[PDB]
Amino acid sequence: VTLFVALYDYEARTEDDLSFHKGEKFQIVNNTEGDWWLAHSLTTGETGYIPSNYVAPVD
């Protein structure tokens, strides 16, 4: 798999998005439905939407 890392902090605004900190890592569950991706946090174990421009693939 390709994991992703947060480039910036983000505070959730809705019921279905995740709050996360810069440096948090994610496994992406779905990214075929636009620029908001369904992601799974490796810190919290939660799954929810994140803005895809806030993450980068881990080398």
From Swiss-Prot:
Quote the subunit structure annotation: Interacts (via its SH3 domain) with PIK3R1 and PRMT8. Interacts with FYB1, PAG1, and SH2D1A. Interacts with CD79A (tyrosine-phosphorylated form); the interaction increases FYN activity. Interacts (via SH2 domain) with CSF1R (tyrosine phosphorylated). Interacts with TOM1L1 (phosphorylated form). Interacts with KDR (tyrosine phosphorylated). Interacts (via SH3 domain) with KLHL2 (via N-terminus). Interacts with SH2D1A and SLAMF1. Interacts with ITCH; the interaction phosphorylates ITCH and negatively regulates its activity. Interacts with FASLG. Interacts with RUNX3. Interacts with KIT. (Microbial infection) Interacts (via its SH3 domain) with hepatitis E virus/HEV protein ORF3.
Tissue-specific expression: Isoform 1 is highly expressed in the brain. Isoform 2 is expressed in cells of hemopoietic lineages, especially T-lymphocytes.
The text of the family note is:
Belongs to the protein kinase superfamily. Tyr protein kinase family. SRC subfamily.
Localization annotation: Cytoplasm; Nucleus; Cell membrane; Perikaryon
Annotated S-S bridges: none
Residue window of the full protein shown: 84 to 142 of 537
Q: What name is this protein filed under?
A: Tyrosine-protein kinase Fyn
Its function, per the record, reads: Non-receptor tyrosine-protein kinase that plays a role in many biological processes including regulation of cell growth and survival, cell adhesion, integrin-mediated signaling, cytoskeletal remodeling, cell motility, immune response and axon guidance. Inactive FYN is phosphorylated on its C-terminal tail within the catalytic domain. Following activation by PKA, the protein subsequently associates with PTK2/FAK1, allowing PTK2/FAK1 phosphorylation, activation and targeting to focal adhesions.
The residue ranges of the SH3 domain are 1-59
Question: What is the name of the gene encoding this protein?
Answer: FYN
The PTM entry states: Phosphorylated at tyrosine residues, which can be enhanced by NTN1.
